Each structure stands twice: as C-alpha cells, then as structure tokens.
Amino acid sequence: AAAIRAELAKMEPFFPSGLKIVYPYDTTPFVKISIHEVVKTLVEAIILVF
Amino acid sequence: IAQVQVQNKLQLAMPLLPQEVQQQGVSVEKSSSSFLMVVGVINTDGTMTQEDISDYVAANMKDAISRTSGVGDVQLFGSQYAMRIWMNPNELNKFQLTPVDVITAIKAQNAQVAAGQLGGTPPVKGQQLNASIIAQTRLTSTEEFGKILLK
Amino acid sequence: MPNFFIDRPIFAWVIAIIIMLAGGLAILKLPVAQYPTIAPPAVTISASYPGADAKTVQDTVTQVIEQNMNGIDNLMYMSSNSDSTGTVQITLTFESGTDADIAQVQVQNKLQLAMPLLPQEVQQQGVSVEKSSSSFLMVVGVINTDGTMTQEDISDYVAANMKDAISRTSGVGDVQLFGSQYAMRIWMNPNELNKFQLTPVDVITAIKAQNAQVAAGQLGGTPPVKGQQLNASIIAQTRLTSTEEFGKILLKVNQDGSRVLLRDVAKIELGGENYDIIAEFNGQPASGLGIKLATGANALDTAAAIRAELAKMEPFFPSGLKIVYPYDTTPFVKISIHEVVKTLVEAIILVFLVMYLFLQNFRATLIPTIAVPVVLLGTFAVLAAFGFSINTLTMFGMVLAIGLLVDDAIVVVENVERVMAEEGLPPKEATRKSMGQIQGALVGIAMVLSAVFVPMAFFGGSTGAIYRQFSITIVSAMALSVLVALILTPALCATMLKPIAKGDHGEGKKGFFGWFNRMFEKSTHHYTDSVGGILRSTGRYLVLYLIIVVGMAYLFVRLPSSFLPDEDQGVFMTMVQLPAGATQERTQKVLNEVTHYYLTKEKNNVESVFAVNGFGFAGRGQNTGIAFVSLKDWADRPGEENKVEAITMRATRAFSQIKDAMVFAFNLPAIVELGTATGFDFELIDQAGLGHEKLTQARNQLLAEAAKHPDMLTSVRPNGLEDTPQFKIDIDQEKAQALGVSINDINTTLGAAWGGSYVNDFIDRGRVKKVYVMSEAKYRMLPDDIGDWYVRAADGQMVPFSAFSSSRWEYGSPRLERYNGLPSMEILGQAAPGKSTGEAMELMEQLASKLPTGVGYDWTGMSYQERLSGNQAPSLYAISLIVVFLCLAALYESWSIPFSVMLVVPLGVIGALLAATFRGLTNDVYFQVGLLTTIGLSAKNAILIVEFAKDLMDKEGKGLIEATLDAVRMRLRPILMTSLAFILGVMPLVISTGAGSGAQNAVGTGVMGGMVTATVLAIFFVPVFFVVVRRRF
Amino acid sequence: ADAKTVQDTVTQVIEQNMNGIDNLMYMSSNSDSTGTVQITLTFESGTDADIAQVQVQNKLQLAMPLLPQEVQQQGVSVEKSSSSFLMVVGVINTDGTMTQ
Amino acid sequence: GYDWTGMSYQERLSGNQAPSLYAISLIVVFLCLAALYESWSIPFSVMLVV
Amino acid sequence: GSDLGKKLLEAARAGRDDEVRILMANGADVNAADVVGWTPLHLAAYWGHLEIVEVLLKNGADVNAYDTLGSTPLHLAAHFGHLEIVEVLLKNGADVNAKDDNGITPLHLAANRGHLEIVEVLLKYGADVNAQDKFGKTAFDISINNGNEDLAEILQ
Ligand SMILES: CCCCCCCCCCCCO[C@@H]1O[C@H](CO)[C@@H](O[C@H]2O[C@H](CO)[C@@H](O)[C@H](O)[C@H]2O)[C@H](O)[C@H]1O
Ligand SMILES: CCCCCCCCCCCCO[C@@H]1O[C@H](CO)[C@@H](O[C@H]2O[C@H](CO)[C@@H](O)[C@H](O)[C@H]2O)[C@H](O)[C@H]1O
Ligand SMILES: CCCCCCCCCCCCO[C@@H]1O[C@H](CO)[C@@H](O[C@H]2O[C@H](CO)[C@@H](O)[C@H](O)[C@H]2O)[C@H](O)[C@H]1O
Ligand SMILES: CCCCCCCCCCCCO[C@@H]1O[C@H](CO)[C@@H](O[C@H]2O[C@H](CO)[C@@H](O)[C@H](O)[C@H]2O)[C@H](O)[C@H]1O
Ligand SMILES: CCCCCCCCCCCCO[C@@H]1O[C@H](CO)[C@@H](O[C@H]2O[C@H](CO)[C@@H](O)[C@H](O)[C@H]2O)[C@H](O)[C@H]1O
Ligand SMILES: CCCCCCCCCCCCO[C@H]1O[C@H](CO)[C@@H](O[C@H]2O[C@H](CO)[C@@H](O)[C@H](O)[C@H]2O)[C@H](O)[C@H]1O
C-alpha cells in the first residue's frame, strides 16, 4: 500500500486539469491504526502498573 | 513455484487455443481473492467523461501500478480506448462489401512494415549514404482510419 | 577460559588442529573470482526485427512487451532501447537479494504470454530472456592468418566445432559467439526477376515449398491388417543441404519449354546471418567466444580447463586458424593471489624478527608463528560457511587485518615475558597472571571492534555489497583472533617459554643485543619522563588535539571521494563515432587508422587491437566503432610512460585531430559501468503524450541550462543518439488498387529485398541453420534503385515501384529510449570539482522542475541507490559510536572512562589523511576500510593502557599520575613491536607499482600513514586523555 | 520426422543451450523415429529440484524459437522426473461388455 | 570412450570416497580422545585397537 | 564537406540562435549540406527556427536550394506548419510553385497537414491551385480525401 501511494505520487503532478485521485476503499488503514491502538494500551498499562 | 508450474502446463495448451483467445492474452496470477484497496479517479472540472477518465488511468496509471511489487492483480473499472469502427450493414451492402473486406483493409492500411535501409550492410564499395527506409506506419487518429481506401 | 587451557595445552592443540583442517579444506573447495557479485540482479529481454527502424521496433515489439511485464516480484525499474539496427533490448533491474532465477522465470513467463501479440517475423527470430551479469571471465579470439576465410567462415567453424565443447567445460557458465553460423544466402537480382515476371514473393514461396520437411507415415502402421509382416517408416521430403540444391530450385517454367531456376535470378552462397558487424584482430578477419564464470566456480581452474579444452581440439583446425586471448582476467587474479600470500608471509617473518629483536629467546618468536596462521586458516573456513569466495576484496580484507592478528599474538606473549622479568614467576604461573591482566580487555577489544565493523556490513546497494566483503572478513578474523588469543596462545606461552630471572632486562648481556636492551631500557625512561612532563601541564595538549581534530576535518573534506582505484588490466578501449549517415566503410578507415596507430607509435606496448566496426555502447550503427587494445605483459611495459593511463593520454592526444570523427581512448572501470564516483545517471521522462520531438526540445532546454552552471555541473550530456535523415516512402493505395497490385506483394517485395527476410531453415552438414532472402547490394543502395524493382499485378503485368509510390526526406530517431514504460532520454553528467554528486543531483532536480508541462524525470544509475540508500553512514557510525561506548562503559564499569579511549580516533585518521592527500590518492573503499582498522588498532592500544592504569589504581591504590605513568611504561614495548612489524609489512604495498598496484597503493598509504601517526601520537596523548578525563569526573 | 532429423533440428539445438546450470551431474537424450525426443538432466544429490526445473526452463527458452514451427506447436515440457513406476493400476471388464 | 551413469555412477562415487571417509573419521576420534584425555599417548594406544 | 559548415548544420537544427550568429560572423558556409542535401536553411525551416531562417537569408542562403529528392525549404516549412517562416521564404523569392521529384508542391503539403493559414498565404503569393502531382492529385483532391471541408472551401 505504501509502494502504491509512492507510485501514485509520481503521477499526480502530471494529471490533466480537474483529474483527481480519491480513495474509496482501503483495508490497510485499519491494520495500521488497529496495531497502534494496541500499542497505546501498552503505554497506559505501564503507567497504570507504575 | 506454483505459478511457475501452472504456466509450464499452460504453454502446452496455448498452441491449441483459438487464435483470438491467444491474441487477447491469457494471464496467470498469484493473488488474494479480495481487494487490498481501490484507487478511484474523478474529474472535478467535469471536463472529461467516465470514458475519458478510464482511458486515462488505463493509459497513464495501471501499467506502473501493475508492475509494483506486491500487486498481484489489477482490475480496471472501465476500459482503455480502442479505435472503434462501427459498421453499417446497409452501407456495406450498398457498396457490395462485407466486414471481411473491412478487416482486410485495416490490416493492409494500418501496418508498420520493416523496409530496410539505403546503403545497408553488406554495402557496395564506395557507399556514402546510409539511411532508414520508412514505409507505412500505424494509424494514429479517427481521421486516418476514416480515409482507408476500401475500393 | 585461558586458565582452562593453560592447564590443558593438548586440548588447545586439538582445537587449533581442527581449525587448521577446516581452514585447509576451506581453501581447497573455496570459490575464486576477481570480484564477488555486487550489482543488483538484472534480466534482459532481447529481440531482433530484421529490416526494421527504431519506431517500428518500438511500437510493435517494445511497447507490447513492456505492457506485459506485470505481476513480477521485486522490480526496481525497467529500461529499454529500440534502434534502427532492428533490435530492442529491455532491461529489468531487481531489488538486491532477489533470486535471479525466480526473477528471470517470472519475466520469461510474462513474455511467453505476450508472444502472440508480436509480429510474426519477430516470433520466428525469437526473443531472448537472459541474466545481466555483464562480467566476462575472458574472451577467445579466433582468427585466420592464412587469409583463407572470412569472419563468417571463422564464425561458422567456431559455432559448429568449438562453441558446444567450451560450454561443457568445467566451470563455464555462459558463452557468446561473436558472429553466427552460416546462413543460406539468396541474393536477388531485380533486373533478372523482372525479365521473368517474378517477385521476391515468388522466390520466398518456392523456398518454403521446395525446402521443407514433410511428414508421411508408416507401412504396416498401427492399426494393421493381421498377417502384416513389415512395419517401416515412410521418409518423404526433407530440408535442402547445399547451395547447389538451392540454386536448383525451380522458380518458373515458360511455355516455350525452358526452366527458370533460383540460381538464374540470384547469387547463392553460405554467408552470415547479419552483416552489421565486422570484427578484426590486428587487421585480420576475426571471431570469438565471450566466456563467463559459472556460479561458485574457481576462476583459475576454469581458465586452465578452457585452455586444455582448446589445446585438446587444436589438431582439428583449418589451415591458418589459430586462437588468441585478447581478454583474460585470470592472470590478474593469479598475480593478486600471489601478492596477498607474500604480504602475509613476510608479515609473519617481520613479526618473527622484531619479536626476536626485542625478545631474548626463540621459543617466543615461535609462538606467533603458530597463532597467526591458525587464525588465518580458520577465517577461510568461516567465509566458506558464509558462501564467500576468494576475490580481490576478501583477500585485501585480510591484509588490512594483519595488524590486528599480529597485535593479538604479540600482546599476549610480550605481556608474559614482561611479567616474568619484573618478577621471577615461572612460565606457567606467569602466564596465568598475565592473562588475568589482559583477558578482560581482550573481550572488549572484540566487542568494540565488532561494533566498528559489523555496522559497515549494513550499507545498501552495490556499494553495500562491497563493504560487506571487507566487513565479514575482518570481523571474522578479528573474532577468531581473540578466541585463539584466549585458548591457543596462553597454552603455548605457559608451555614453550623459558624462565627469566626477576630484574633481567638483557641490559647485562653480550654485544649488540645487550646494547639494544640497554638503550631501550634507556629510551623507556626518557619516554616516561616526557609523559610526566606532558602530564605536568595538559592544556598545551588539549589545544594541540583541537588543532589535530580541526586539521583532520579540513584535510578530510578536501580529499576527493571515489569508488575503486583504476587499474592497468593490460587492456583498454578507444571509441570511434562518425556523423549522421556515416557508412560502414568510412568508420573502417578510422578504426584501421586507429589500429595502425596502436601497432606502430605504440609497438612497444600494444599486443593487439580488436577492431569492432558497428558497435557502440550508447547505440549501434554503421557510424560507430570500438577497438579493444590488448597490451603486452606488464614485464614489457615498465615506466609510467608505458601504462594504460599514460598510453591513453598519448593515444587520445594523437587521435585528438582525426578530422573525420571523435576518437577518444580510456582505461576501463574497476568493475561494472559508470560507477563514476562524481557521476550521476539522469532520466528525462514524457509523462503526458508529448512525443519524441517535444521530449527532445525539453532535453535541449535542460542541457542548455546545465551548461550555465559549470561550477556545480560538469559533462551534462545525453547518453543516446541524435535524429537523422530517413527515407520516407509513401505507397499510393489508390494507384495500387487501380493497376491491380496488392499491398502485401508491395511490402514484401520492398522489405524482403531491402531489409532482408528470414524464410526458413536448412541443414548444413548436420546443423539446422537459417535461410535468408535479400537484394544484392548493388540494387538496394540509393533512392534511384527503388524504381528498379517490379511487382506482378493480378493481370500479370509487371509494375515498377515508381508507378505506385513517392518519397521524401525527413528526420527520425535511430534509437528511441524508454524508462518504466514511458518515452525517455538518459542524461549522464558529474558534479563539478569540489562539489558532491548529491549537490549536483539536487541542482538537476531544480532545473528539471522548470521544464515544459508534461515532462518529468527520475534517477536510475548509481543515483537510484543514492536517493534511496541515501545515507546511513552517520546513522550507522553514530550507532557504531554508541555501541563502542556501551562496551567500554561495561569493560571499565564507568560512564566516563570510555571517553579517554574514544578520543584517539582522529590520531590515526590525520596520518592516513596526510599520507593520502600527499601521495595524491583519494577517499575510496580501501582507504576507508583501512581507516577502520587503523582506528581499531589505536583504540586497542588505548583500551590496554587505560585498563592497566585503572587497574593499578584500584588494585595497588596508586595515584592517577603514578598509575598512568606505570601503565604507559608497561605498554610501550608491545605497542612498539606491533607498529614496527605492521608498518614494515604494509610498506611493500605502498611502493608497489603496476599490476593491481592501484588497490595496493590504496590499502597501503592510508594504513602506513595513519599507523605512523596513530602510534607516535597515542603513546603521548592517551595518558593525557585518561588524566584529563579522570580529573573532570 | 525421423530420428536423425529430430536430433538435428531439436535434440542438439536444446542440448547446446543446457550449459550454465548449477549442480548438473550428467545429461542423456533419445531421438525417435516417431519424431519424439527426450532430454533428461540429473543434478547433485542435494539439489533443490524446483530451482533445477526453473534453471532448465530458463535455458530451454533460448532454444524454443530455434525449433521447428511444428515442434513448438506440439509444445515442449520441462518436468521433474523419475525413472520407475511406483505402481501400475490395471482395469478390466468382468462381464464382457467392453473391449480393450 | 565410456562413462558410468545412474546406479553405477553412485556406486563409483561411493567406493571412491570411502578411503578419506575412514581417514578423516579416525583422525576425529584420535583428536577427541587426545583432547578429552589431555594426552597424545592415551589416544594413540587406543587407536591401535581399530 | 566544410569545417564550420558541419557546425552550422547542427546549429540550425537545435535552433541555437547565438551560435549561428557567431558562426555567421566567421563565414561558416551557409551552403553546406548533409548527405541528403538539407541545407542550414532546410533544417531551420523544417524544425521551425524563424530567427536562424532570417539570419541565413541575410547571409546569402539560397532560398530555393533543393535536396536530393527535389524538396525546398518552402516545402518543409509549409508541410510542418511554420507560418512565419513560410512567409519569410516567400518574401525572399521562394518558388511557391516548386515541385519535388514527385510533383508535390508546398500547396500540396500544406493542404495535407490541414494548415489553412499557410495555404491562404500560399494562395496569396500566387500558388497554382490546379497543380497536380505524379498521381494527378490537386490540393482540392487531397482536401476531400481527408475530409477537411474548411480547407476544401478555401480551395475554390
Ligand atoms: C542476550 C540479550 C543481550 C545480551 C547481549 C550483551 C552484549 C554485550 C555487552 C557487554 C560488552 C562489554 O564488553 C565486555 O564487557 C565485559 C563485562 O561485562 C568485560 O568483562 C571483563 O571486564 C570486567 C571488568 O573488570 C572484569 O571484571 C572481567 O574479568 C571481564 O569479564 C569484557 O572484557 C568486555 O569485552
Ligand atoms: C623510542 C621512543 C622514546 C622517545 C622518548 C623521548 C621523546 C622526547 C620528546 C619529547 C616529546 C614531548 O616533549 C615533552 O614536552 C613536555 C612539555 O609538554 C616537556 O615538559 C617540560 O616542559 C613543560 C612545559 O611545557 C613543563 O610543564 C615540565 O615541567 C617540563 O619538564 C618535556 O620535557 C618534553 O619531553
Ligand atoms: C555495546 C552495545 C552495542 C550496541 C548494539 C545495538 C544495536 C545497534 C543498532 C543500530 C541501528 C543501525 O542500523 C540501521 O538500521 C536502520 C533502521 O533499522 C536503517 O535506518 C534506515 O532508516 C534510517 C532512519 O530510519 C534512515 O536514515 C535510512 O533510511 C536508513 O539508515 C539504517 O540504514 C541501518 O544502518
Ligand atoms: C566439538 C565441537 C563440535 C562441532 C562439530 C561440528 C558438526 C557439524 C555437523 C554438520 C552436519 C551437516 O549436515 C548437513 O547436510 C548437508 C546436506 O548436503 C551437508 O552438505 C554436504 O552435502 C552436500 C549434498 O547435499 C554436498 O554437496 C556438500 O559436500 C556438502 O554441502 C552438510 O553436512 C550439512 O548441510
Ligand atoms: C568434530 C570434528 C568436526 C568434523 C569435521 C567434518 C569434516 C568432514 C569433511 C567433509 C568432506 C566431504 O567432502 C568431500 O571431500 C572429500 C575429500 O575430503 C572428497 O572425497 C575424496 O577426497 C579425497 C581427495 O583429497 C580423496 O582422496 C578421498 O578418497 C575422498 O575422501 C569428496 O569428493 C567431497 O564430497
Ligand atoms: C510499558 C508500555 C508498553 C509500550 C506501549 C507503547 C504504545 C505506543 C503507541 C502510541 C502511538 C500511536 O498512538 C495512537 O494514538 C492515536 C491518537 O492519540 C491514535 O489515533 C486515533 O485517534 C483517535 C483517538 O481515539 C481515534 O478516534 C482515531 O480513530 C485514531 O486516529 C493512533 O491510531 C495511534 O497513533
């Protein structure tokens, strides 16, 4: 998904007028945030343990 | 290895398939069944239709996304352009011609022939000029296709 | 652990012996090559469209293929060339670490599913998908002195009688033939064809009909009628086997009775498959075999094997046929391995000497003579275990390590001898105490040194692959060094060393040796007095240190960074390029003119000139050529005046005025392509549907603005070809229909005659080979010849091309490039003197942003792995730096003492830099790795001084100054012996000239200088670091 | 095609491109009067069979285009092989209502 | 000329590498005894039993 | 060929105005030619570099030089849509009815590429509207076979 965005970025500058990329469906964001949330609960745990 | 083995067998069948199936290109991919994502593309200045946009993504974006490592298959939600020749049976009959003639004409007048060079190796002794010979070339516009001489 | 083996010397020997055996086996079955593989895996797709122009090849083959290279794993980028020689080459570069085999098959498969979409004639020619090694083991030239055969004859003979046998030779991977096996040749005559109302179409038809294989069947074939007695195969028509039969092909029968044969309208001869390249060896028709080394094979064995194979097949060559070796890296490699074996050997002797010069007995001198080898042997075994090979890099990684292994040997021994004298302890108990003093430090040196070196095995790209060869070799050797120093040397010392009575320093000894001792015990007192005096007012030195550090930075940034030192590999090139339209004959004059120069005004050095007319790295064509100059042996070219660098300047100079074209000469890269340290590889891209012409304008624009910054940019130039006059022929469709002439009869009569046409095959003395049809040279040279060809119309009349066509001149590209599927143009260039490639790129990026709408850009050469592997050096050495810190902090159980050791880094660097800048060398891979070993040794010295000093304070209760003085006193001798032995050992590398001398000079100076500086400086500065550091906290 | 022909137009053309393959111990081949040919490659006992097939196939590709049109039309398989049969499963008819 | 293949090839190789197989093997036993018994005499005495 | 001619031939190609000007001050043969007979003038006209066309004409350039196949700078200019150049060449005596080896005239080429503005200019300086090529075709003919009615109309 990161590689895809990188490629998409090399394209955008040359798009015709008004042409624009939109992102309607991505299963990636979930994965990333979901993990970051579990990390978050960890920091809290150490604090609550402290 | 799986993809490799499947294709090994597939090339055994390739010769046995109809010319037209082969020319559409048969593919062999290794990917998950569901979508990782869907990259959408729209036009905010409403200056290009869904046909114009689809053709643009297919001609300026898909190829490079399809070559990206990790991308196992790319489905285009639209179609790339093609030179479209919409035949009229009435006019065809009128001039006593059939799609056969039409297909044959496009093959003969929308060609890209190799014609060698002037002073090409092995040359005669004393040759001073060497240049490429450029004969027919692919058609590039509806106008060029429109004036193909049928008869 | 050292105690353990001190009591078990036999066990120690066992461990040593095992290491020796494994090591022994290691160098037996261990690979051997000039260089390991460092370039990223690449795969090339080659295709040939005879008679086709760049545009035609691109739009019907290149584009088609490129559009199907989807779904392949780890592709970094893809580039291609479509040229007017009718060929296309698509190169796909994959991520480092990718399995080249998987990469190739995944590419090959996508191609197979794109083949139906390619033109038929391209499908008959074939499309080759191969790996892009780009490195040849050697190239065998095959020439005929008898003047009894052409390069096409030499080629055929080579392909049918030598090719196959070489490929089967042990250790050879691939093999490229320089030419082709015969091709049946049908050279048509248009005046003769018309006389019989025939066309190249009738010709081709007859050949396909009369030169074929026809399946028949069997007699009594299954299912038979019972009672059948025989079963036999029915052999029908098979392929033609001779020019005679081809000439006998029936083309037509007139109603008067006569028979028109093929030899009646064309010349029939066994010729070449293609005529675009004419190769010569000292003016004689030539051919050859490019040979690559097979994976994990021994280069030396292969060279010998291909040799024995050639010799073995010599009795069967035609008169005047003899082979030659224009290019062979084996000799170099052999020399390289020799020179590395000397260095270690003499280094081992040198250690023996000084070891004996300072020490009294032989039993001592003997100990290191055992330890070092064991450590070296074992290192080979470890490399084997990591699938490494014996190559230019790995071997030098070992020479740059000598000092580290010599030190470990001398340190453990010298300390034992020093303990026995300063106190009557016997060999054993004295070895136990000695180790108890250093053993701790010893593990530190190990951890710290690995902290310095392993990080280097983490750079990416081809550069990272190089650092990795040194990194693993050095760390391993070092690693085994501490092990051996902790197991084998203690046992040896407590076992072979003779007792020495308390207080005996040889001062009361015989002549010379007795004098030396007296004087050394003397200089030691002076030395300790200088330190006491220096430690009496440190400020002076804190100031000197900054001066040093400061001078180091200045001296550093002024040192021009580079890749690997050029070398005299006894061969070099000379490029020849003529104007647009330049014929093959014209560049032959030049190449001959170049050849002559080399065989005359350089008869003393040049051995042979292989003149290849028709090839040019940045584009093939009739107006391009290259001459590979093979020089005489090194032992016949003494004097810088007679070296590639020199010869090159003199050669280019001499050719600097040939008014027909540009003809420069040049040495070749240490490895593969550009690699230009100061060079960058730009790629200009058509992002919209702009087109070749608009891309060109954009190129020019970018190049003009580049020429306006000679302060940052230098040599900005396109790596491709310029447009040229093309002959555009227009076929009038209306006229062809009116006269009854078919477009297909027109396009094949044209292209076949003028471009050539691969009809089908025939068997030549047992080997299938192609059959080509094409006009005879004289009838396909100029625009006026076009009108001499005729086409039969339906009504049977013959009609001249001039009746249905018309032409005109125009410009077109003879080489269309393409990057990642889009139209493109490559641009090379380099940073101006003093500027960094990074700065140079950044500017090109700023200038490219000012280009016409729709023009993008991207980097791809060494530039790709620099915008990506951008930089880790600091983030890597900051880690190394941090790592080293924690280690010391652990060794000394102190958060501050580590600084007293770390402060020595610049001490050796300045020396290396001084020697560097002075000898004129540059900041290259060897120079750098050398800096790492020098720092390492100096760091070691410090660790052991601080360890002793801190030791005395904690154990004896001695004062800061007293401890320091006492430590420095004890560490003086050992430290001196190592430097004396190492500096002398490295010395032969510094002066060495010719034959791999570049690498040796590189590894030599930076080391000798940094060594001289690190030693003379550390003994006076570390005491100051320890003291001022301890004072502060 | 006959044996000598197939060996000239197919067998030898393939064999020559079977160089530069890791761990190749030996190579053998047959060329029949039924126009059929077979080339077997055996590798060092510890070789990875899949990589061996891949490498072979990569080299066989260089040869495909140099083969007769009708040989390509029949397709050429590159497969991992063994010489003996594990078993032979037979099939017969007990009520005589089926010929061979 | 001639050569041995398949079954016979393995057989040739089998017998051809048997000598150094026994050689390296005896050596490893000797060296092991040596080490374990911190002696050159003990291992040599036993190895004579082979 | 000539020493500086080669340089002048490449200059007019890329349109390097300044080098051409310096080359003029040195006498670089304005009559040099590549293997097919293109002159600095042919090139500049082909590639559309007006200034260099104007400079070349100021320095004795043959405004009617022709190539190996009979094509002139006016042929090239008209054919590739460089109106300003088409006017300059005509203004300096370019043969408006010049015929190449095929019977093609600047008017044919302009019509074929549909360059209206250039055709009118060509008509202006007296181009022969009934000129026929080796196949008998006139600019009108080519006009209708292309389906360019705007053009077809101008041609009346
Ligand atoms: C497994 C997860 C993480 C584990 C990885 C551990 C990394 C190693 C970090 C320690 C590096 C310190 O480097 C090493 O320090 C140890 C102490 O511990 C030193 O140990 C030595 O010095 C101490 C200090 O007097 C002596 O008491 C002792 O006789 C001796 O062992 C070594 O001489 C040194 O080489
Ligand atoms: C083979 C190696 C053995 C070589 C040993 C002999 C080397 C002698 C060269 C001296 C190098 C440094 O030189 C050393 O300078 C310090 C000052 O910094 C001097 O020290 C002297 O002057 C300083 C002032 O600067 C006073 O604080 C100090 O009380 C006084 O004794 C030493 O007298 C001198 O020896
Ligand atoms: C005595 C204790 C010993 C200490 C041992 C502790 C382990 C040392 C690890 C230090 C890490 C250095 O290793 C480093 O890895 C990081 C990311 O993982 C890479 O870092 C990568 O991203 C960094 C920042 O994210 C970028 O500058 C660059 O793209 C690249 O360096 C480095 O290219 C590599 O060199
Ligand atoms: C007292 C200290 C104790 C240290 C003792 C060291 C024990 C070492 C045991 C190694 C056992 C190896 O077992 C594993 O099998 C592979 C399979 O090939 C062997 O590998 C070997 O056979 C292959 C065939 O496949 C041969 O081509 C080749 O000569 C070699 O690599 C190696 O032996 C190892 O990879
Ligand atoms: C605890 C101790 C550690 C165990 C040490 C393990 C070492 C094992 C050695 C593995 C050797 C196997 O790899 C093998 O090398 C031997 C030679 O030695 C070769 O076989 C042959 O080599 C030699 C040549 O010197 C022949 O004379 C001998 O008859 C035979 O041994 C095989 O062609 C190769 O496959
Ligand atoms: C001893 C302790 C063990 C170590 C534990 C370390 C855990 C460190 C994880 C913290 C890093 C990410 O922190 C995380 O907080 C963010 C907001 O603050 C989350 O972001 C979230 O913010 C909002 C807060 O509910 C949500 O509505 C959004 O959906 C989401 O964007 C990120 O998804 C994540 O970045």
Author numbering:
A (entry chain A): 303 to 352
B (entry chain A): 102 to 252
C (entry chain B): 1 to 1033
D (entry chain C): 52 to 151
E (entry chain C): 856 to 905
F (entry chain D): 11 to 166
Reproduce text from the manuscript describing this model.
AcrB of Escherichia coli is such an efflux pump belonging to the subclass of resistance-nodulation-cell division transporters, which catalyze drug export driven by proton antiport. AcrB associates with the outer membrane channel TolC and the periplasmic protein AcrA and allows direct and efficient transport of a wide range of toxic substances. AcrB exists as a homotrimer, with each subunit containing 12 transmembrane (TM) helices and a large periplasmic part formed by two loops between TM helices 1 and 2 and TM helices 7 and 8. The trimer consists of three prominent domains, the TM domain, and parallel to the membrane, the adjacent pore domain and the TolC docking domain.
To analyze the interaction and to characterize the inhibition property of a selected DARPin, we determined the crystal structure of one inhibitor (1108_19) in complex with AcrB. The crystals diffracted to 2.5-Å resolution and belonged to space group P212121. The crystal structure of the AcrB–DARPin complex shows two DARPin molecules bound basically to two subunits, named A and B, in the homotrimeric transporter, while the third subunit, named C, is not bound. Unlike previously determined crystal structures, there is no 3-fold symmetry of AcrB with the DARPin molecules stabilizing three distinct conformations of the subunits. As can be seen in the crystal structure, the DARPins bind mainly to the β-sheet connecting the pore domain with the TolC docking domain interacting, as expected, primarily through their randomized concave surface area. The three AcrB subunits are bound in three different conformations, revealing three distinct channels. In contrast to subunits A and B, the gate to the central funnel at the top of the periplasmic domain formed by residues Gln124, Gln125, and Tyr758 is now open, allowing the substrate to enter the central funnel from where it most probably reaches TolC and is exported to the cell exterior. The opening and closing of the channel entrances and the gate is coupled to structural rearrangements in the putative proton-translocation site in the TM domain involving residues in the middle of the TM helix 4 (Asp407 and Asp408) and TM helix 10 (Lys940), respectively. In subunit C, this salt bridge is not formed; instead Lys940 is tilted away, forming new polar contacts to Asn941 and Thr978. We believe that the three conformations likely present intermediates in the transport cycle and suggest a rotary mechanism for drug transport where the three subunits strictly alternate their conformation in a concerted way.
